Design a protein around this ligand. Sequence first.
Ligand SMILES: [Ca+2]
Length: 330
Amino acid sequence: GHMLVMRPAQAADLPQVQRLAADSPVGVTSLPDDAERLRDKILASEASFAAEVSYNGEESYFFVLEDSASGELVGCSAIVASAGFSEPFYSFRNETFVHASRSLSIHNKIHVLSLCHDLTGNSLLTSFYVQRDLVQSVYAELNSRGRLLFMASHPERFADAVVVEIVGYSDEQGESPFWNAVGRNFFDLNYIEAEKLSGLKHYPIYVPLLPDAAQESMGQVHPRAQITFDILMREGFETDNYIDIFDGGPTLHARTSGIRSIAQSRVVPVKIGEKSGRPYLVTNGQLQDFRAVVLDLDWAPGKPVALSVEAAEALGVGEGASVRLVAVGS
Ligand SMILES: [Ca+2]
């Protein structure tokens, strides 16, 4: 019985963000359980939001979902404006080549993994986490897609395409088949240790030569990340031929013109003071004072959005304001 409100991360959020980070999968290294890294993450976001008339691609935007009554943070998510701006964004490219056997007349098409940084410049969705009780709720939708609404309101700050690397598969002892078959052979840490290390901080590989379990794990997600994957599938993202260099998790991609919560979002005037319908994700369209909530509205294009006094307070909007909204849908 409390409203949840999405807003930019604030410095004083650090201990609450650390709690989220500690509960998130270790393979979500964009949300490391490390005070120093999280402080840097929040500072970077604060700088990005604060510079309201300048941006150059170095930016990142870190959002938290807050219980408006208690102040408890129950989720978080982030956007990186330009993948690889400061340090290269590495992936394995899954590519094919054909080895011609002249004497057999076989032209054998073979998959290989090649270390690369092809995804540079794309905007990147990262750091997604919600508490267990928000899984498969409109609030998980808000926590993820509120970033997309933000991107719709500020298109110039971001690329025309978005990528997301979903945490790969590891079992309930924290063993990653892909890590064990690949990276661990070059640096013998277990997966959890390698990801903890990744958090706190060249020739092709033949796919046919990898163990079956590792092959099967390529492009698979951590069970706890299926929610994240599914939200994005409904948004219009599709898997791309790049996988994580540690765990082989899939990379998703979409053009902004084809992302539901960008392309189908609308800017609408409000009328404040007073019905049931269906859930909408609603933002105030602002930068530093960005706010987003889920509202049950009886609304359609062509009329103003009717907001309650409570909803307008949460959104930080008043008379004559506009909001950006999109149906949660299905
Ligand atoms: Ca990853």
